Structure 1
């Protein structure tokens, strides 16, 4: 038995973002993940310097023809994240369409990377003309999506000020296409204090009996004093892995996903501090490799609230 994933994301030489944050973890859990590298840079763009090349829609299509010609275009999952250009994204959409025709049971996990917000206001970090494509072509095709608060607000067109508006926006997202919507981070208020970020998740599904039900959860995570890159990619990847293992249990899938990132960042936070005192982007690269054990079976450190 084998579960095949096609992950189209960026590659870097040094560090863990994109395909570099998604691949090792999924491989450790038994997945035959195939990495299509949308770009190859020396490191992520949060560093003072970075150089590299990008893959264009033509080349992505060639890579695909190669696979198709060998009749190797049969996947169980497809996984996308940061996509920098409309032309590429329209191509990723054509590829997902054909893979779904090839296999109707294919699950498309899509991280709709658009931007994020810093201390109150958010701004986009991909071309604005990608939003219409995400709205009309990509999300309708998705089975699981992992937007942060900023991205859900752009996808739904509604600002989110409360948990209830969050739920309403999540329902809106469900109606665009995906049965699983997880808001990966938000500045919603927590009763635990203000040094907490909020994760919300909602999954629609049919039970053996055949009724269409919805599981909803919330997690209040304590904030770590640092900026990490790649953890959004890691979140989407682990979510793929754990909903795959616990299909009818969003609570457990999310707790394992959020617990894995917690163990990775705790281990990362330790070494960052030891090597420094104000850690640079380099010292803050996720301690991926050293976290093998926590990825394989993470001790659950945060229980979710049931909504």
Structure 2
């Protein structure tokens, strides 16, 4: 009923990019057309990796193959980590063409650039700032990426929501900072996540619903969390288009279930007191199917 075009990485083993996004979206009832931007044996956190990268021209070929068969029709577009400027520009062209075809198409974009250090070529920051974010409808940056895109440092929740207002102005009606260094009432081990949604009333007036979320931190390095998060947020905002509170509660709860099961099974696979390897920390995606289909609400968002 609802078709998503996901243009992301593919790994033979593991869950990142499309591997982390297609399965959940599929179990949540979405048809998914997947462009594997790369094919690697595993993600680059392993000691070794081998694979091939799809060229931008090759991406264009695949899109034109869908187009000439008149099956380039989508309700959503979903993207995440990209290392090549050409590739991201081609993605923006595809998004613009699709939105010209369907004005109600929702572009969900994780503007992957950095964290805490920027681990993407610097020439992509302008592209994300001036080309990608403007045509995005839902963006899931972390705090550092929100600062990069806005140009302003965030020292407070008030400043964070001012930056999120700037990002709203740049395009997306829904902005979720998924991770931040903001202090939490609950403790130092809770991370703060913020949500802002511009809701257009029939009055013609627009009101900004703002929400606060705090989640217990899992102290382990996971790969693909942003991709899973953006995919499930796509799903749950689709089901709750004017209730970002519930959409984010469900997304964060499913994430918590997935990460809890993953760390449990990783510690089991490794020895007690032993640090799980990157191979052992792969998101236990299939085993969380049920939790992804209907997540038990384990986090409550606070309306501001």
Q: TM-score range by the shorter chain?
A: over 0.9
Does the 8 A contact of 1:255 with 1:304 survive in 2? yes
Partners of 2:21 and 2:203 in 1: CA distance: 35
Q: What's the Cα RMSD here?
A: 0.8
| Greater alpha carbon shift after TM alignment, 203-212 vs 272-281 | 203-212
Deviating beyond 6 angstroms after TM superposition, the runs of 4 or more aligned structure 1 residues are: none
Q: The residue matched to 2:115 in structure 1 has which SS?
A: strand
Q: Please, which runs of 5 or more residues in structure 1 have no aligned partner?
A: 118-122
1:50 Cα deviation after fit: 0.8
1:282 is matched with which residue: 279, 282, 293? 279
Partners of 1:225 and 1:257 in 2: CA distance: 19
Q: Deviations over 1:254-288 (max 9, x none)?
A: 00000001001111111111111111111111110
Residues 1:163 and 2:162 aligned together:
no
Partners of 2:237 and 2:57 in 1: CA distance: 33
Q: What corresponds to 1:130 in structure 2?
A: 124
Q: Please, which runs of 5 or more residues in structure 2 have no aligned partner?
A: none
Does the 8 A contact of 1:73 with 1:102 survive in 2? no
Q: What corresponds to 1:193 in structure 2?
A: 187
1:180 is matched with which residue: 174, 182, 185? 174
Give the TM-score normalised by structure 2: 0.97
Residues 1:79 and 2:78 aligned together:
yes
Q: The residue matched to 1:204 in structure 2 has which SS?
A: strand
Structure 2 counterparts to residues 190-269 of structure 1, below 5 A:
190-269=184-263
1:141 is matched with which residue: 135, 147, 151? 135
Q: The residue matched to 1:128 in structure 2 has which SS?
A: coil
1:18 Cα deviation after fit: 0.6
Q: The residue matched to 1:96 in structure 2 has which SS?
A: helix
Partners of 2:95 and 2:103 in 1: CA distance: 11
Partners of 2:72 and 2:280 in 1: CA distance: 39
Q: What corresponds to 1:303 in structure 2?
A: 300
Q: What corresponds to 2:12 in structure 1?
A: 13
Partners of 1:207 and 1:234 in 2: CA distance: 30
